[PDB]
Design a protein around this ligand. Structure first.
Ligand SMILES: CCN(CC)C(=O)c1ccc(Nc2nc(OCC3CCCCC3)c3[nH]cnc3n2)cc1
Length: 274
C-alpha cells in the first residue's frame, strides 16, 4: 500500500495543467524528515476528477506497481491522501517539468549529444522495467521529467526520470486510445488486451521522435479517424530533421511486436552513435 498522507499536511497551490482524467497542482507537504527535522516539501499533486472516479483503481495501481521498484530514473511517489471525496497521488516535484514542453521551449538550444544522453537514460529506465517484466504502457515525452538541466560549466549532462503511466489504456475509452496514436501501438488499437512489454518498445520509438522533433507531436495534424487509417496503411513516421536516430525510431516502431528489439539491444545501438 501507499503511505497515507494527511489532508491536514497538504497545501494545494497553482494549477500546472491536466492529464488523462486528472488535475495536476503544485503543492506543499509538511512532513517530519530525516533526524526528526520538520520539512515543508514541494510536491506534485495529481487529483482524479470527481466526474471519473471509476478509474481510481487503475489511476492508483499505475503508480503503485512502479513504486515497489526503486530506481534512479523512476519518479518517486511520496504517498496518497484519499482526502475524502478526492483521490490524490502525492509525487516528487521535479524542478524543470515535462520534457515535451522543455524540448519545445529549448529547441534551438538542444544538440544531438543532449538528446542521446536523454535517450540513453530513458532506455536505461525501460531496460530496468523490462528485466522486471513491468509494463509501463504510456511512454511519451510528457511522462519524462527533467530533474537537472545540462551544465556547460561542469559539462554535466541533464538528468531525467520516467513518470507513472496514469490510467491504463486497457480501461480507457476507445476515443482516448485513438487520440494517443502513434504512442499506442497498432496491436493495442486493435485490442487493448494486447498490452505487452513490446508496447513500451513501440512507444519508446515514438518518444525518440519527440526528442528529435524539438517538441512537435507526431501526426498532430491528423484527426482520430486519419490516425487509425495511418495504422491501417502501415505507415511509419517521417524522419526527424535531426535524423541521427531515424533508424532506431523505425526499428522500435515495428508493426510486428515480436520483432521490436530488446532495450539491451536498443542501448547498445545508442552507444554506437558516437
Ligand atoms: C517555466 C515552466 N515550468 C518548467 C520549465 C513549469 O511550470 C513547471 C512545471 C512542472 C514542474 N514539476 C513537475 N511536473 C510534473 O509533470 C509535468 C507537468 C504536468 C502538467 C502539465 C505541465 C507539466 C511532474 N510529475 C511528477 N512530478 C512532477 N513535477 C516544474 C516546473
Amino acid at each position: 500500500v501507499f503511505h497515507k498522507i494527511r489532508n491536514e499536511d497538504l497545501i494545494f497551490n497553482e494549477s500546472l495543467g491536466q492529464g488523462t482524467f486528472t488535475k495536476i497542482f503544485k503543492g506543499v507537504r509538511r512532513e517530519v524528515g530525516d533526524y526528526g527535522q520538520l520539512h515543508e516539501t514541494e510536491v506534485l499533486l495529481k487529483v482524479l476528477d470527481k466526474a471519473h472516479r471509476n478509474y481510481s483503481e487503475s489511476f492508483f495501481e499505475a503508480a503503485s506497481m512502479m513504486s515497489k521498484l526503486s530506481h534512479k530514473h523512476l519518479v518517486l511517489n511520496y504517498g496518497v491522501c484519499f482526502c475524502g471525496d478526492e483521490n490524490i497521488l502525492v509525487q516528487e516535484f521535479v524542478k524543470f517539468g515535462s520534457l515535451d514542453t522543455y524540448l519545445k521551449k529549448n529547441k534551438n538550444c538542444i544538440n544531438i549529444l543532449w538528446k542521446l544522453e536523454v535517450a540513453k537514460q530513458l532506455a536505461a529506465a525501460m531496460h530496468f522495467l523490462e528485466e522486471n517484466t513491468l509494463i509501463h504502457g504510456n511512454v511519451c515525452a510528457k511522462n519524462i521529467l527533467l530533474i537537472r538541466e545540462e551544465d556547460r560549466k561542469t559539462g554535466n549532462p541533464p538528468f531525467i526520470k520516467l513518470s507513472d503511466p496514469g490510467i491504463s489504456i486497457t480501461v480507457l475509452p476507445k476515443d482516448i486510445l485513438q487520440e494517443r496514436i502513434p504512442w499506442v501501438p497498432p496491436e493495442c488499437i486493435e485490442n487493448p488486451k494486447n498490452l505487452n512489454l513490446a508496447t513500451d518498445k513501440w512507444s519508446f520509438g515514438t518518444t525518440l521522435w519527440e526528442i528529435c522533433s524539438g517538441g512537435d507531436k507526431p501526426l498532430s495534424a491528423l484527426d482520430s479517424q486519419r490516425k487509425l487509417q495511418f495504422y491501417e496503411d502501415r505507415h511509419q513516421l517521417p524522419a526527424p530533421k535531426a535524423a541521427e536516430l531515424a533508424n532506431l525510431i523505425n526499428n522500435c516502431m515495428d508493426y510486428e511486436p515480436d520483432h521490436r528489439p530488446s532495450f539491451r539491444a536498443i542501448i547498445r545501438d545508442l552507444n554506437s552513435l558516437f
